[PDB]
């Protein structure tokens, strides 16, 4: 349940460490993003001398949320912080490695390469 | 929030007669004394109720 102004952990090695959601894409009054949705983020804090500067606007995919969402088989998975991964123009991960676990709705949202680069899929 | 014109006596009478209307309570004569008591209540005159004493009626 990421909305506008939400803070997120950038979970990849581009350089950013904190991002802020500034728009939820795909819908007119759309208000919440879930796992596997694409949002527009601004970078609020980054590793020094990186390829990503503080104050740039990118698109990112949500990989962990702190609010559980129902699955078909009845299981709910609820992480402990909200985290996203930056994307380039082709809607593919800009980074080369992903930190921590991700949720398996990326599988269905067709982010197979994010899933592969993740460490654990829950 | 104030009356605009004084209402007619017809309207006032109608409202008053409809609202100030009290309904009779139901009755049922006591099995003991024959008084007409309120249905489903202890008799206030003899104290019995379904042939059972519950009160001790005084003056």
């Amino acid at each position: 349940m990421i909305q506008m102004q939400t803070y997120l952990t950038i979970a990849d090695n581009t350089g950013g460490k904190v991002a802020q959601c500034i728009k939820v894409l795909g819908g007119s009054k759309r208000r919440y993003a879930k796992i596997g949705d694409i949002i527009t983020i601004v970078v609020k804090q980054a590793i020094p001398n990186s390829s990503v500067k503080k104050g740039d606007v990118y698109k990112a995919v949500i990989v962990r949320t702190s609010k559980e969402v129902r699955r078909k088989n009845g299981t709910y998975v609820r992480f402990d912080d909200n985290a996203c991964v930056i994307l380039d123009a082709n809607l593919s991960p800009r980074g080369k490695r992903v930190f921590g676990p991700v949720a398996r709705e990326l599988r269905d949202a067709n982010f197979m390469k994010v899933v592969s680069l993740a460490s654990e899929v829950i | 929030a104030v009356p605009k014109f004084k209402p007619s006596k017809s309207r006032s009478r109608t409202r008053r007669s409809i609202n100030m209307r009290k309904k009779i309570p139901q009755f049922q004569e006591c099995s003991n004394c024959g008084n007409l008591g309120v249905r489903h209540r202890i008799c206030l005159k003899c104290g019995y109720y379904r042939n059972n004493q519950y009160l001790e009626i005084g003056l």
Partner: protein, 121 residues
């Protein structure tokens, strides 16, 4: 719409309702027969029958529970010794509430609550 079924709230906050119930149950056990508003008596009997059925069996632990509600020692002993042993067999319905009419003055619905069988003397 109304939730919280099981009370009447007796028109008063929780602590004062609890105190009201305790006092009226004490008086009821003391006097074998009381008169009051129908709603108050209804709740009183809901709790008095529960106390009697808990006191059907006399043990230290049961007595110490019943003290958490009955704070009059004399009436606690009376409940455990003189009242229940006559309802040892009855499966329920130890009390009897019977209506009395509308009271003059504020037109409350009065009623009388009493025990079906009077206890040992």
């Amino acid at each position: 719409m109304k939730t919280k079924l099981g009370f009447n709230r007796l028109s008063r906050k929780s602590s004062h309702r609890r105190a009201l119930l305790k006092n009226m149950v004490i008086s009821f056990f003391k006097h074998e027969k009381i008169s009051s508003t129908k709603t108050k008596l209804f709740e009183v009997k809901r709790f008095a029958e529960r106390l009697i059925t808990r006191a059907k069996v006399d043990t230290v632990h049961n007595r110490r529970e019943l003290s958490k509600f009955i704070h009059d020692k004399h009436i606690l002993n009376k409940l455990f010794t003189k009242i229940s042993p006559v309802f040892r067999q009855r499966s329920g319905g130890y009390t009897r509430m019977i209506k009395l009419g509308k009271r003059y003055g504020d037109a409350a619905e009065m009623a009388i609550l009493e025990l079906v069988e009077k206890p040992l003397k």
